[PDB]
């Protein structure tokens, strides 16, 4: 099951980005869709399922790609995107 079931809702995850500092550079819509919520500190986000954290986002970073790059064992990632997607990133 998820590490943090309370953030399993995409809508709740999106709401968490109200004070996101990088709206143009990395859209909250994409971050939330990819399982991430904003911690509220700097640009630090975390996946509700695997609890993997990511920071220091660069302009044009793709949340799903970074999710698969750093946390390829996440079951939310697997269910959402499939194994072929994860394999291709590695
Ligand atoms: C360029 N794209 C971005 C999204 C990215 O790849 N970020 C990575 C990342 O955040 N990682 C790598 C796996 C672990 C994670 C880290 N999280 C933290 C946190 C952290 C703590 C709580 C929540 C979120 C992040 C604090 C200090 C260092 C790291 S490295 C690295 C890349 C190399 C420079 C430092 C960050
Ligand atoms: Zn995850």
Q: How far is CA 88 from CA 11, 17, 44, 45, 64, in A?
A: 29, 29, 26, 24, 12
Entry resolution (Å)? 1.7
Length of the chain equals 90
Domain that holds residue 62: 1-90
In angstroms, rounded to a whole number, what is the distance separating the alpha carbons of residues 76 and 48?
9
Helices first, then strands: H and E counts in the chain: 5, 3
Q: Which of 8, 7, 38, 6 is nearest to 23 (CA)?
A: 38
SS3 state of residue 36? strand
Q: Tally the domains of the chain.
A: 1
Experimental method: X-ray
Q: Ligand 1 within 6 A of 22 CB?
A: no
CATH code, domain carrying 25: 1.10.1170.10
The DSSP code sequence of 51-66 is --EE--PPTT--HHHH
Of 54, 62, 67, the residue with max ligand 1 atoms within 8 A of its CB, to mutate for a pocket test, comes to: 54
User: In whole angstroms, what is the distance from residue 19 CA to residue 59 CA?
Assistant: 17
Q: Does the beta carbon of 71 lie inside 6 Å of ligand 1?
A: no
């Amino acid at each position: 099951g998820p590490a943090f079931p309370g953030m399993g809702s995409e809508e709740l995850r999106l709401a968490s980005f109200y004070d996101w500092p990088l709206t143009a550079e990395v859209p909250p819509e994409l971050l939330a869709a990819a399982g991430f919520f904003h911690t509220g500190h700097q640009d630090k986000v975390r996946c509700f399922f695997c609890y993997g954290g990511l920071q220091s986002w660069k302009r044009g970073d793709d949340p799903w790609t970074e999710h698969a790059k750093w946390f390829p064992g996440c079951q939310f990632l697997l269910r959402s995107k499939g194994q072929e997607y994860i394999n291709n990133i590695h």
